[PDB]
Amino acid sequence: DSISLSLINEGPSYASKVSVGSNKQQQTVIIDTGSSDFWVVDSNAQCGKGVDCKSSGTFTPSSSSSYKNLGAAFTIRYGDGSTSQGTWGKDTVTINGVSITGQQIADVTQTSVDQGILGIGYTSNEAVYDTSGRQTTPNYDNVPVTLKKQGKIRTNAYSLYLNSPSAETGTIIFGGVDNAKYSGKLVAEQVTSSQALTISLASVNLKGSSFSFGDGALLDSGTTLTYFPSDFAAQLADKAGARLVQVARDQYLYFIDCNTDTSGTTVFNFGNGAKITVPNTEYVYQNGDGTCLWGIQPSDDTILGDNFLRHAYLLYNLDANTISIAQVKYTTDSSISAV
Amino acid sequence: VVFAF
Numbered sequence A: 001d002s003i004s005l006s007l008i009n010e011g012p013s014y015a016s017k018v019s020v021g022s023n024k025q026q027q028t029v030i031i032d033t034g035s036s037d038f039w040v041v042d043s044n045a046q047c048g049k050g051v052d053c054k055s056s057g058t059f060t061p062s063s064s065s066s067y068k069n070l071g072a073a074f075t076i077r078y079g080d081g082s083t084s085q086g087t088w089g090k091d092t093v094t095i096n097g098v099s100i101t102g103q104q105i106a107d108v109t110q111t112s113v114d115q116g117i118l119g120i121g122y123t124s125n126e127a128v129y130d131t132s133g134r135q136t137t138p139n140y141d142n143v144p145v146t147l148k149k150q151g152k153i154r155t156n157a158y159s160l161y162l163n164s165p166s167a168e169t170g171t172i173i174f175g176g177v178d179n180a181k182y183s184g185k186l187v188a189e190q191v192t193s194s195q196a197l198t199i200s201l202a203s204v205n206l207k208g209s210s211f212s213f214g215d216g217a218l219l220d221s222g223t224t225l226t227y228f229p230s231d232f233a234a235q236l237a238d239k240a241g242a243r244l245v246q247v248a249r250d251q252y253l254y255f256i257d258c259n260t261d262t263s264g265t266t267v268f269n270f271g272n273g274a275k276i277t278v279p280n281t282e283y284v285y286q287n288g289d290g291t292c293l294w295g296i297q298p299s300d301d302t303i304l305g306d307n308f309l310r311h312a313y314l315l316y317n318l319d320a321n322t323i324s325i326a327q328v329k330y331t332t333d334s335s336i337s338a339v
Numbered sequence B: 001v002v003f004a005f
Helices: A143-149 A230-240
Strands: A004-008 A014-021 A025-032 A036-046 A068-077 A084-095 A098-111 A116-121 A157-161 A169-174 A175-176 A189-192 A198-206 A208-218 A226-228 A244-245 A253-256 A267-269 A275-279 A285-286 A291-292 A296-298 A312-317 A322-327 A337-339
Touching: A004 A025, A014 A169, A025 A036, A036 A084, A084 A143, A084 A175, A084 A244, A116 A230, A143 A208, A169 A175, A189 A198, A198 A230, A208 A230, A226 A230, A230 A244, A230 A296, A253 A296, A291 A296
Parallel strands: A025 A116, A036 A098, A226 A296
Antiparallel strands: A004 A014, A004 A169, A014 A025, A014 A084, A036 A116, A068 A084, A084 A098, A157 A169, A157 A312, A175 A337, A189 A322, A198 A208, A198 A267, A244 A253, A253 A291, A267 A275, A285 A291, A312 A322
16 A cells, blocks of 8 residues: 655645645645645635745635634744744545545645645654744644554655656655666665654765765755755865855855856765765756856755755655665656555 | 755
């Protein structure tokens, strides 16, 4: 029992069509290994200034016979500064024809995100706190846990195939693994945090140099680019020619010339001899205006986002606390086994 | 984008 779900490559994010409520109201929502809560855009939400938050489906709680309004205020904040607020509730959620009942979600009535988010990370990382960090509501069974608990999958686990940079679609598989879509063997890596799907990154090879790292990296489907501590990012920027630019009082971004040569690869070395090779096309990102970002950016948090993850096949196992990885093989061939 | 806290 595996559940395949199509991932829409939207550019900066990968989203899936899911349904919510007794009347199966279609929501197109970001598939996010970096958050743990599922929220939907209320049909009467107030979007953030300049944000078209109602173009990817909306949810009307009043037309679902099964919708339960829990008492409780919902608030979440993301790495890029975006936020959502609303109220906690429960309803039926349907994923590629497979329904789960009484799933706790948030009904969002204000958001600066473009669409809803389906957070599928650890339950310990749920957004169950007020602004000051006081816990306001209990931790609860999020979507992957509920899939397991209601007998839809055997193990709280999922495989991620973002597919190639040009592809319109990829696939996420809850409770299974597509053994046709990688070369070599999946190498199991220990998850190093009890809250975040992070594994140890031993080193990064770029432009003929090996840069020792030895710290955790978040494998985040819901991040576009790749983020590293400032000093490590600066070491890589030195080989690549990326230049740091101050864009706000506290924000700095690496820019790079749009016509920069993109031959060569960047290699990421993990535990147990696991290795992911990323083509350097992944490190030039086109902005609207004729400038480009470098695909690595500085941050206190280390995150391998989509520009990395497109080049790996990943089996996240939240029960075993492992993420198993192998170099991706882009193919329509498919041979899925349950996990 | 960069998805929690």
